[PDB]
A and B are shown apart, each in its own frame.
Chain A
Amino acid sequence: MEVKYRGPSDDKLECEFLENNLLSCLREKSVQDNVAKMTCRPEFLVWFFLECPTKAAVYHDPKGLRNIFIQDKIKQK
């Protein structure tokens, strides 16, 4: 197959969508999917690590992930 090359998008809106899906998946899977309604889409998780390298590196960093978790907890009250 003749597959052309295009680097990771790092688009603001696309990465916001993928990061929202990632946060939903983290919150759902951290309790073994005990939520009433599960909105996580595992497939988009893959794309989060293919088109948002900056946010992926932030999530891997322990301090960045701690900040993200704190902000998500504040948002979820």
Chain B
Amino acid sequence: KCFFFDHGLKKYQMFEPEDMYTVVFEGWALDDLITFPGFTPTGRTNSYQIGLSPRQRTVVPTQTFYQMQDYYMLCGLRFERWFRCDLVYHDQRHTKFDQVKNQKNYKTYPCYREY
């Protein structure tokens, strides 16, 4: 019950997470009240324990520069690889790739993963 019934609107409303001081000593001054939409669109339950989803394929590995917590050389390397791929395909994007007018000729841009 992270939502409250409103008598003026006669409906459930809510606001963003707020601290105890603001909830208690500024309950009269409440801003940005949004009608409660429900946890799920169909009214089912959403209370589940979550975990880590499977990882994604890597084109430029992080292990090239992994001793460094700050990723600056890795950032440069990955951007350079993406820029090579883009220089290959940059002008064909609107005719053979994501930016086509019709979905019939839609293809994923080859540099999406590197980007």
Contact = CB atoms under 8 A, between A and B. Distances in A.
Interface residues of B, number: 11
Contacts of B10: 13, 17
Given A13-B10, A17-B10, A17-B11, A42 B5 contact: no
B39 A43 contact: yes
Contacts of B103: none
A44 B38 CA distance: 9
Nearest to A6: B1
Contacts of B5: 9, 11, 13-14, 17
Tell me what chain B mostly uses at the interface: helix, strand, loop, or mixed: loop
Nearest to A47: B1
Contacts of A13: 5, 7, 10
A43 B11 contact: no
A42 B11 contact: no
14 contacts: A9-B5, A11-B5, A13-B5, A13-B10, A14-B5, A17-B5, A41-B38, A42-B42, A42-B44, A43-B38, A43-B40, A43-B43, A44-B43, A45-B43
Interface of B: 1, 5, 7, 10-11, 38-40, 42-44
Interface of A: 9, 11, 13-14, 17, 41-45, 47
